[PDB]
């Protein structure tokens, strides 16, 4: 569930 | 920015725009020809708006200037987050003054509980998706690395920082990635991860600006 605050998010499994 | 207020035009002045056709990150200038950001934010071709308000309109403090280099550190890692940050340089030098001008490199880390300003164009919601067209501010608090670490077992390096609120409604976003964590005047952080927005118990995580200082030097020095 983790995301960067990027347009748009990187994000992972937790 | 989840929670925060309207800055004011051009009040901070260092805040600048990563765009590709679109807003997609945020940066920090430092001097008239480079920027500092999130190696996360990383693409090609990139237009670095400065001296922006309302990024939808053209207002009158507006300079684009394409990157010439794009640099991102040697060993950031995209799984962890670690070493999260990048510098740009500018292909002409900015023209600095009220509206457009560098913020300071820290000269000594900063402490826990002193309080900052966080700045970007990203979402205001932390439920659904709204993008503002003026930039968003912030006050937050650095929190200790004991709160951090228990917000983020196991994933929180000597590169990173918490700052915002546990109790949830108050945090950067997406789209505010790369821009800057400013405290006693100094660029501290760099907007990078967490989880969510604003969620209880989980505050946002910001590159450590002072364990880069050196090799942000040594960087624009040899380019
Ligand atoms: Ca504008």
Redesign the interface.
């Known amino acids: 569930?983790?995301?960067?605050?990027?347009?748009?998010?990187?994000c992972?499994p937790? | 920015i989840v929670g925060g207020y309207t800055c004011g035009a051009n009040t901070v002045p260092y805040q600048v725009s990563l765009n590709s056709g679109?807003?997609?990150?945020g940066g920090s200038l430092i001097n008239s020809q480079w920027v500092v950001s999130?190696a996360?934010?990383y693409k090609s071709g990139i237009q670095v708006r400065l001296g922006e308000d309302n990024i939808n309109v053209v207002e009158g403090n507006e300079q684009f200037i394409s990157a010439s280099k794009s640099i991102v550190h040697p060993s950031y890692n995209?799984?962890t987050?670690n070493n999260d940050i990048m510098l740009i340089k500018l292909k002409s030098a900015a023209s600095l003054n009220s509206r457009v001008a560098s913020i300071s490199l820290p000269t000594s880390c900063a402490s826990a509980g002193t309080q900052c300003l966080i700045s970007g164009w990203?979402n205001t919601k932390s439920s659904g998706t709204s993008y503002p067209d003026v930039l968003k501010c912030l006050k937050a608090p650095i929190l200790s690395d004991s709160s951090c670490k228990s917000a983020?077992p196991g994933?929180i390096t000597s590169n990173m920082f918490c700052a915002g609120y546990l109790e949830g409604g108050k945090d950067?976003?997406?789209?505010?990635?790369?821009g800057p964590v400013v405290c006693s005047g100094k660029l501290q952080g760099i907007?990078?991860?967490?989880?969510?927005?604003a969620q209880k118990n989980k505050p946002?995580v910001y590159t450590k600006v002072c364990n880069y200082v050196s090799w942000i030097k040594q960087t624009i020095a040899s380019n």
């Open positions: 569930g983790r995301c960067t605050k990027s347009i748009p998010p990187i992972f937790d | 679109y807003h997609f990150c999130a996360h934010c995209s799984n987050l990203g983020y994933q950067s976003c997406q789209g505010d990635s790369g907007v990078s991860w967490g989880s969510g927005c946002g």
